[PDB]
Amino acid sequence: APTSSSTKKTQLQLEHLLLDLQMILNGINNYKNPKLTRMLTAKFYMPKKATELKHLQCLEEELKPLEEVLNLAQSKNFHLRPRDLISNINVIVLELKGSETTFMCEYADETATIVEFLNRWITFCQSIISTLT
Numbered sequence: 001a002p003t004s005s006s007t008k009k010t011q012l013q014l015e016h017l018l019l020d021l022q023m024i025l026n027g028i029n030n031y032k033n034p035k036l037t038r039m040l041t042a043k044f045y046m047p048k049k050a051t052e053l054k055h056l057q058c059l060e061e062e063l064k065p066l067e068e069v070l071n072l073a074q075s076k077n078f079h080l081r082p083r084d085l086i087s088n089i090n091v092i093v094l095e096l097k098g099s100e101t102t103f104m105c106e107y108a109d110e111t112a113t114i115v116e117f118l119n120r121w122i123t124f125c126q127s128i129i130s131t132l133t
Contacts, residue, residue, distance in 0.1 A: 010132075016092055017125045020085040028070070029118050030077040042069045042114035045107035050124050051131070053097065058105035059090035062117055069114055086121070 003009040031039065044065050047055045063086070070083060112120075 013092070013096065014125065014129060017089050018122075020089045021122050021125065024078075024080060024083070024085050025118050025122060027077040027080065028073045028114070031073065031114075039069060039072060040113055042066065042112070042117065044112045044114065044117040044120075046112045046116045046120045047105055048108050050120070051128065053093050053128070054101055054103055055105070056090060056093040056124070057098065057103075058107070059093075059121065060087060061105065063087050066114070066117055089121075 001009050001012060003012075033039075042065065044062060046062075047058050049055065063083075067083075070078065
């Protein structure tokens with residue numbers, strides 16, 4: 001596959017991010033319970049902006065606040081034992097580059113529930129690609 005030329009392997013690395021995001025987060029997004037009063041605990045502090053691969057570093061710390069809510073989504077839909085797969089996507093954005101940039105994940109604007117982290121990284125990919133060309 002054209003890798004060093006980069007004309008099309010950008011699409012392959014792309015399928016990787018959407019591969020672990022859809023297989024993993026599509027299952028945790030199946031919470032069709034009308035009683036999610038105990039699920040507001042998500043409190044995920046999603047970043048303000050996210051138009052570059054730099055904000056992707058927040059993924060490694062987001063696994064902590066999301067781990068607690070994972071206990072309620074642990075039975076059928078989100079039964080993939082390896083939840084680290086999303087944290088693995090963070091390891092592949094670091095291997096792609098994640099180069100010299102001391103930038104503390106600036107979260108702000110307001111706190112968020114579990115639907116904001118979901119659409120956050122899934123929409124993170126589908127968006128950054130629609131602006132490339």
